[PDB]
Motif scaffolding. Structure first.
Motif, PDB file in Angstrom:
ATOM      1  N   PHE A  25      -3.874   7.903 -37.963  1.00 51.79           N
ATOM      2  CA  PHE A  25      -3.315   8.384 -36.718  1.00 51.79           C
ATOM      3  C   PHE A  25      -4.107   9.588 -36.272  1.00 51.79           C
ATOM      4  CE2 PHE A  25       1.104   6.476 -36.074  1.00 51.79           C
ATOM      5  CZ  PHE A  25       1.064   5.543 -37.112  1.00 51.79           C
TER       6      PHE A  25
ATOM      7  N   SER B 212      -3.120  11.572 -33.059  1.00 52.69           N
ATOM      8  CA  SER B 212      -1.864  12.290 -33.207  1.00 52.69           C
ATOM      9  C   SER B 212      -2.022  13.494 -34.131  1.00 52.69           C
ATOM     10  CB  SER B 212      -0.792  11.419 -33.833  1.00 52.69           C
ATOM     11  OG  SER B 212      -0.583  10.280 -33.049  1.00 52.69           O
TER      12      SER B 212
ATOM     13  N   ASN C  29       2.014  10.195 -28.241  1.00 55.80           N
ATOM     14  CA  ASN C  29       0.977   9.432 -28.932  1.00 55.80           C
ATOM     15  C   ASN C  29       1.517   8.746 -30.186  1.00 55.80           C
ATOM     16  OD1 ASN C  29      -1.727   9.448 -30.952  1.00 55.80           O
ATOM     17  ND2 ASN C  29      -2.130   9.043 -28.796  1.00 55.80           N
TER      18      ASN C  29
ATOM     19  N   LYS D 251       3.012   5.324 -29.586  1.00 52.31           N
ATOM     20  CA  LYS D 251       2.204   4.162 -29.241  1.00 52.31           C
ATOM     21  C   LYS D 251       1.623   3.556 -30.499  1.00 52.31           C
ATOM     22  CE  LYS D 251      -0.008   6.465 -25.245  1.00 52.31           C
ATOM     23  NZ  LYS D 251       1.243   6.202 -24.521  1.00 52.31           N
ATOM     24  N   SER D 252       2.450   2.931 -31.306  1.00 51.29           N
ATOM     25  CA  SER D 252       1.947   2.428 -32.570  1.00 51.29           C
ATOM     26  C   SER D 252       2.820   1.273 -33.036  1.00 51.29           C
ATOM     27  CB  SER D 252       2.040   3.537 -33.633  1.00 51.29           C
ATOM     28  OG  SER D 252       3.438   3.992 -33.747  1.00 51.29           O
ATOM     29  N   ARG D 253       2.265   0.497 -33.946  1.00 53.53           N
ATOM     30  CA  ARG D 253       3.070  -0.572 -34.536  1.00 53.53           C
ATOM     31  C   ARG D 253       4.265   0.039 -35.250  1.00 53.53           C
ATOM     32  NH1 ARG D 253       3.868  -3.478 -39.413  1.00 53.53           N
ATOM     33  NH2 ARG D 253       4.170  -5.726 -39.007  1.00 53.53           N
ATOM     34  N   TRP D 254       3.990   1.134 -35.997  1.00 51.74           N
ATOM     35  CA  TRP D 254       5.021   1.829 -36.761  1.00 51.74           C
ATOM     36  C   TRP D 254       6.274   2.026 -35.910  1.00 51.74           C
ATOM     37  CZ3 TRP D 254       5.640   7.570 -36.185  1.00 51.74           C
ATOM     38  CH2 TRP D 254       6.649   8.098 -37.030  1.00 51.74           C
ATOM     39  N   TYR D 255       6.072   2.601 -34.720  1.00 52.70           N
ATOM     40  CA  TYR D 255       7.187   2.845 -33.824  1.00 52.70           C
ATOM     41  C   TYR D 255       7.838   1.565 -33.350  1.00 52.70           C
ATOM     42  CZ  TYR D 255       9.772   4.471 -29.808  1.00 52.70           C
ATOM     43  OH  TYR D 255      10.767   4.788 -28.930  1.00 52.70           O
TER      44      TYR D 255
END
Ligand SMILES: [Cl-]
Ligand SMILES: [Cl-]
Length: 162
Positions: A114, A117, A132, A135-139
């Motif tokens: 990341f 970030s 930021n 904007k991720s798969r994690w989220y």
């Protein structure tokens, strides 16, 4: 509130082998056993971890022991990581806990990915980092947990966990 309590809220506690959100064999307080699709393989990593034939079941104390080891390793891994160390050192106590949480969930490698970030966190640009981070798969895969961590990075307080 502290890192242990925080992760305990996020991971829960389960005394029998179970599958995590990604379908991987896990046990205790979010302790990944293996990514292999075989239960047997998981039961095998489990006994090795605990030091006895567990038959896929552990006690509370045993879970806690894995937990302590996991937390300690996460911290040590952050500190030995050239990408992570600098961030961690720049943060206040509450935000450090948020970074540990991400490492415990996704591994050092994951977190170190990341890049953008991390830079914003280091610069203390809280709102921009939180956008930021989102904007991720994690989220997208674990939004509730991610919202709690993100809010912690944004505010520097334990509000999302109270
Ligand atoms: Cl282990
Ligand atoms: Cl979630």
């Amino acid at each position: 509130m502290n890192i242990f309590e925080m992760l305990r809220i996020d991971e829960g506690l389960r005394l029998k082998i179970y599958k995590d959100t990604e379908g991987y064999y896990t046990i205790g307080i979010g302790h990944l056993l293996t990514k292999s699709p075989s239960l047997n393989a998981a039961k095998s990593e489990l006994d090795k971890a605990i030091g006895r034939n567990t038959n896929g079941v552990i006690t509370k104390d045993e879970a806690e022991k894995l937990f302590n080891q996991d937390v300690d390793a996460a911290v040590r891994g952050i500190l030995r990581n050239a990408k992570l160390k600098p961030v961690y050192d720049s943060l206040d106590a509450v935000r450090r806990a948020a970074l540990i949480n991400m490492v415990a969930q996704m591994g050092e490698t994951g977190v170190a990915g990341f890049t953008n970030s991390l830079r914003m966190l280091q610069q203390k640009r809280w709102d921009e980092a939180a956008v930021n981070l989102a904007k991720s798969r994690w989220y997208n895969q674990t939004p509730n947990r991610a919202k709690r961590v993100i809010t912690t990075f944004r505010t520097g307080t334990w509000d999302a966990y109270k």
